[PDB]
Design a protein around this ligand. Structure first.
Ligand SMILES: Cc1cc2nc3c(=O)[nH]c(=O)nc-3n(C[C@H](O)[C@H](O)[C@H](O)COP(=O)(O)OP(=O)(O)OC[C@H]3O[C@@H](n4cnc5c(N)ncnc54)[C@H](O)[C@@H]3O)c2cc1C
Ligand SMILES: Cc1cc2nc3c(=O)[nH]c(=O)nc-3n(C[C@H](O)[C@H](O)[C@H](O)COP(=O)(O)OP(=O)(O)OC[C@H]3O[C@@H](n4cnc5c(N)ncnc54)[C@H](O)[C@@H]3O)c2cc1C
Ligand code: NA
Ligand code: NA
Lengths: 115, 115
């Protein structure tokens, strides 16, 4: 009932993916070498500080197995979608369809249901 | 009505402050020099990538005037609260009472209304 309270593991995850997917959606289609490096470092630093040491450590192992592809907006948005799907799978959640990431996180559904 | 849609400026801000205030709340009381540097860089990289170039640029100017104090959890949580209050003030919102940051973003209100 109270709005207004510290977020739990789930509520923080939901905020975090919204922040992550949204930053990804507006990342350049042709980023400079510096921007590519800055985004890889950003994702790295995010995994260092994400609290709940059960979620961050799993995440750092996952990122060690699978480095952020920050080459282009296309590559980075799909990479992040596939990353997020590994966590969905681990938690018994269904795969999100990565072809929809632009509609979900930038443009809105092509049927206009976000209008 | 649809849940489920790309976040607007306001919804993204609300997610972003929740992510920022929550990362701050669990930052060490005695962070290593490396962690202090990693958090300052984290905040910097966040302002580089925050989308909507009207909000990010204002933010980068604000951070140029006012460097993240990442010395301790106490210092960093209060600094971030004061940062957020500058944005509240700019938008005609009232000041949030920074003594409440722990209750709001870590522990819950001492009256137990988050229980
Ligand atoms: C980096 C990270 C690591 C985490 N690790 C763990 C963990 O180890 N264990 C744990 O219990 N929880 C972890 N969480 C929390 C967890 O992933 C969820 O956020 C939480 O369980 C709530 O799930 P949900 O059903 O609300 O949807 P979420 O998984 O929060 O997703 C939010 C929304 O994003 C959209 N979406 C779903 N998948 C994708 C995708 N692949 N690409 C783009 N958009 C998508 C859907 O619209 C969905 O409603 C983590 C969260 C973060 C951001
Ligand atoms: C880095 C950043 C920069 C932004 N810059 C702009 C901008 O230039 N122009 C613009 O129109 N919008 C900007 N926004 C969006 C804006 O700050 C708000 O997020 C949005 O207007 C929604 O406001 P709100 O009333 O939902 O509460 P928000 O400001 O989103 O706050 C969310 C919650 O945090 C708590 N809170 C409020 N203040 C503090 C505090 N000082 N310390 C700790 N907790 C607090 C309150 O419980 C509040 O309900 C920015 C957001 C981010 C994160
Ligand atoms: Na998930
Ligand atoms: Na604000």
């Amino acid at each position: 009932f109270r709005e207004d309270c510290p977020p739990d593991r789930e509520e923080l995850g939901r905020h975090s993916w919204a922040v992550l997917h949204t930053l990804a959606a507006y990342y350049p289609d042709l980023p400079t070498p510096e921007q590519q490096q800055d985004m890889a470092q950003f994702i790295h630093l995010f995994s260092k500080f994400y609290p709940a040491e059960e979620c961050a450590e799993d995440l750092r192992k996952r990122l060690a197995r699978n480095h952020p592809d920050t080459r282009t907006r296309a590559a980075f948005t799909q990479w992040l979608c596939h990353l997020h799907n590994e966590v969905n799978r681990k938690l018994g959640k269904p795969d999100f369809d990565c072809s929809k990431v632009d509609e979900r996180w930038r443009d809105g559904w092509k049927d206009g249901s976000c209008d």
